[PDB]
Amino acid sequence: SFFHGVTVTNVDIGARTIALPASSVIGLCDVFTPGAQASAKPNVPVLLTSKKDAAAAFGIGSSIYLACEAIYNRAQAVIVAVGVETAETPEAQASAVIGGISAAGERTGLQALLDGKSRFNAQPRLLVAPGHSAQQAVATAMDGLAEKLRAIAILDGPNSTDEAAVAYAKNFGSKRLFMVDPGVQVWDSATNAARNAPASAYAAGLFAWTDAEYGFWSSPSNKEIKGVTGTSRPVEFLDGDETCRANLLNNANIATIIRDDGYRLWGNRTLSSDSKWAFVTRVRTMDLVMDAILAGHKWAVDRGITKTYVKDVTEGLRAFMRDLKNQGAVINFEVYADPDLNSASQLAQGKVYWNIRFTDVPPAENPNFRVEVTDQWLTEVLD
Template sequence: MPEYLAPGVYVEEVSFRSKSIEGVPTSTTGFAGLTRFGPVQYAGGPSSTEPRLITSFTEFERVYGGLEPLQIAGDERVNYLAHAARAFFANGGQRLYVSRVFTDNNSPPTPDPASAHTASLQVTLSDGSKATWRARWPGAYGNALVDVRLSRSKNLAFKYSADPSDILNRASWGVQLQRVKNGSVIELIRPLPADLSTLPKSNDPLTESRLYVVSVDSNGQQRFYSSAGGPAAALPDDLGNMQVYLVEMAVQVYADNGRLDSYTELAAHPDQHRHIGKVLEADHPEDENAIVWLDWTPDLTTDPFAPARLMKALRDAPKRLAGGNDGTAVPGPASFEGADADPDHAEVKATGLKALGEIDDIAIVAMPDMSGFASDDLIIDAAGRLIAHAETARYRIAVVDGPKNSSITQIREFRGKFDSSYAALYHPWIEILDPLVPTAPGIPPRKLLLPPSGFVCGIYARSDIQRGVHKAPANEVVRGLTRFEANINKPRQDVLNPEGVNCLRFFEGRGSRVWGARTMSSDPEWKYVNVRRLFIYLEHSLDKATQWAVFEPNNDRLWKNIRQTIEDFLLVLWRDGALIGEKPEQAYFVRCDRSTMTQNDLDNGRMICLVGIAPSRPAEYVIFRVGQWTADAKA
């Protein structure tokens, strides 16, 4: 309560309206699976391993690599997750979180980064010390080519001229050196060659005897360290007989899919703003999608000339990183499920599906690699873990792929293993033209079979954006395919549909469509995908928007505010067509009063609100009854 302690005018803000509920997003999707590159937890690696939000397939390629197959244990494996991401965005998806899985035989990360399938390249400096280029993440994609080039600024040495018309030579030598910051590397060429055309070009090799590292103390005093040792207070002043260059680096990183990353104006001293170790560091590089980082920790107190040694060594060293690979075994279902974060060790982050569980926005989850396991038992195990994840998280639904090349009997047996309203099964697989193989005249194009989850998740998102979560994500066109793996006709769907297998079908003149919207539940109340997702949307929105009510006085004023808040939200849903009923009173009710709470509830701090809605269910069977009509018959 406000306090009024002295006479005066008091202006106070009060609210005369109920709180509002903002609906949560329903189209944000999460994938867990194998990729060629990207954030993943391994010992000695970067700490920022959380699933990355991706908003386009171009961004996916920069973060997680391209569509090229994975090479695991010497075997080529289709990069299902990358193709699923491509299909997701092609079919209308807009926001995708990716949790990369990379663990051999479900074992914990190895302690040595060099043995964690991470590419590296060691560079030896002239004093015998080492600097190492490392890929930020494990995978063969990290075997990049790193080209370090030099840039020499124009001559820093000028003769002083008292003639004010001599603009080019008005600056003195001292003024020029003040522009050179602490840690800069300069190259001094003295005496000048007779043929000035032989002066070094920008990327010519460095000669250590010509190099100096500038040191500036707190008083602005400059000293110049050379390879010979101790500092010099000044450089030679015969300006007419020498050239002085400021030397900087540029790094170009080439990946195997044509990607080129360029970083310019780099320095070699840690005090420099664009120190190469800061711009290209493990945890927080200038480019968060950088492929490589430089592992170098010099002792500049004992060797202040080290930055010049590093520049020369990086420029002259081999360029190709090596040792990166995609693993020696395919991770099992336990690795896809992942592990929770360790609350006692901040550096141990959640992995796999568990990492997606920490992201509140995700409403749809899938594991496109699930059906690529070698045995049916592993596929069933992985599907069970995916469904359990959706049920545990409560506010999301799992899109499950059936096994590849499944017959009607096999897909029915697979479906019979599960019973959950938080999952939906889609069949069959989808054939596309392989985007990695260009078409050529006279040569049949190469085809590729993909699990349907990537396409379906994109259709979920598209339907949500265009119509709303209450619209069943069915009778929607599937984009980016040549055909379905199997032809599902009406008699076959008559068998599959009642059992909760959502079929993908081709209709002449109407294209390829999703032709089912059922969950994997035996409970008729939760038979339809859109009904389950509507309740997920409503429950999650209420959960987030009513947190303000915790610890408020539990009385009639609070109950009325809660009722009005929820009724306002449900009225909008009814107007959007999510609820059935000619009047709002027929579509929903909200009760929060003495009829929903006993005195015991009040004594124990419980406020209970009862919300009932009448969700709209899809017109799965459209029936027209036609009969004969005679001219003199009365209606």
């Protein structure tokens, strides 16, 4: 007979919803002085949320707090900060910043950011290392680490001059590097006077402002930065001419703070050879929708690949991408199951493909205006 009663099986099918995780969590790693007021341990990752949670953690005056304060002053954001004890020589200090792994097995230094995901559920999708980035060594660690986190490591090249900034950017070429050359100077509270900063954390907090406001898909450039009071090496910028020096650095894929004091930062060009990923925007949107689809369809995995299931996942992308379109994240999209890929043998191994394709919105970094007079509408002056 089998059962013989009255069943009520819940058919668990339908297009699941998908979200945009992480969005813009900052992954900082400067230095401080562990002791009394410093609640945070000399190396482990610590989650932040506001200046209060950061102050009692690392302490006031700590070089790391001047970086966190620079971010929170700009725009509030999650900062899975690490922080490492200051070393003797400046060179060997970069070792603790990069961090090998230690005998304890726990990832030390900058590499500790990989733990931020499996501890705080906040994958730092925006690396930054104020002060420690002009060095060729630590800069590559930021590059390699960014690909693990699908983040955008914001470097900060040495001031000195422009020649030294271009020669520095010529080294890298990865999608996930957004360097800023001119070191903005902030008014330090402890020194009670001018004080040059790496301009790394300021550019990082600046992103968090646009990401929380407009969106991650919005370009950060041409947005004013707060907590400033001048800029080391005044990068010139005319009203509208390619002759200005602010432009020449952008050709070498470099961000710069223009005008007096610190009016605004721009230079969307990420240190990338491939012109496809020229904008930092594209890298930021693509790394997001990828991590979303990855972490989103974790419910599916091994499950009955019936015609319903394919449509449930297909409609899952239809609705998802359409929530990005009307939101303005993308201009237009198209998702479907490829006939050629989805072969009878591929499905028999569990493989099932969905060709997603779209156009992330590029920032109009140079809108032209071909204005030109004529003598056309002159006969109109008659009748």
